[PDB]
Symmetry: none
Subunit: 185 residues, 2 copies
């Protein structure tokens, strides 16, 4: 089991082509096929209301992490309110748009290919402990200090365990999102 830590102060802001905001890539699988990535973690800055790009064949789970929330319109809609730290799953082929009813928003974005990855996502707080055989475990901090696997994650830092091949026993303290990804087949 290899531990890597992604520090948010090292993230690179990539403005969107449409000027509606920007993306900070955190990490992703190798995923270099014409098929593309198997999974990707990023933080999206959403600066103005607008539509979301499509990602046919991918599952998305997004979570507001900065800002008071925003409203989403998914396909044929009831409008969905996204509050801070409330994750929201939707298919990547859905037509989705957001309205920034309180100002600009930052989302924590998980996207993965159901064909290629098993996936688990859970926001947690306090002291947590889990056992997992998942190949990749990610811990994304939204606190000043999330302690996990001997590391201290600051704000939007992300710890990544890779190449797990046994049962990991992981304790976490603090407000963070736990993601577990395992290659299928």
């Amino acid at each position: 089991s290899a531990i890597s830590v992604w520090r948010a102060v090292d993230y690179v802001r990539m403005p969107w082509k449409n000027g509606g905001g920007s993306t900070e890539e955190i990490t992703r699988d190798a995923g270099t096929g014409l098929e593309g990535f198997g999974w990707r973690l990023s933080i999206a800055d959403i600066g103005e209301s607008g539509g979301f790009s499509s990602f046919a064949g991918y599952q998305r789970v997004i979570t507001v992490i900065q800002g008071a929330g925003m409203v989403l319109t998914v396909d044929g809609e009831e409008q969905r309110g996204l509050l801070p730290l409330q994750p929201f799953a939707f298919r990547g082929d859905s037509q989705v748009s957001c309205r920034l009813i309180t100002g600009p928003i930052r989302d924590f974005n998980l996207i993965y290919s159901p064909e290629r990855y098993h996936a688990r996502l859970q926001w947690v707080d306090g002291v947590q402990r889990f056992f997992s055989t998942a190949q990749t475990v990610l811990v994304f901090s939204v606190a000043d200090e999330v302690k996990v696997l001997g590391e201290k994650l600051g704000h939007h830092d992300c710890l990544q365990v890779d190449g797990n091949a046994g049962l990991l026993d992981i304790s976490v303290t603090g407000r963070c999102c736990l993601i577990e990804l395992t290659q299928r087949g």
Copy 2:
């Protein structure tokens, strides 16, 4: 002392903001929340001439590992030709641009914070043996087989020893880069 072996097939690639190329992450230290990584290994794919990101307070050592070579301009100063496997050191704060003259180039990139890490870098071939108290030892292979510490590194695989706390006795065979990093505590 824990050994990880990063396999080049799993190197996560990220494209550059300006589109000039891409960076494959090899490994980086855990860093801190405030100051980000203290060091990083990566392979940069340079597909177009152009400028290099600046990294104030960081020291860089880059080495052409694929392609016939390229020309650097460091600040406004004289051109530097980088030939395959000739390491070149420069400050992260210097404005640096490269001119491709033979096509795209791949660089092995070391970066570290001199305030936070002692560092050593040496390209070697053949049989090597060294003793080092360094806390982290990385061996980056540019050969089909580099034997070190009972592992076998293939093309651009990278061995990493962490948390060494005595005098390591390390033997290496084959064409590779030896990097040693120690926190300045």
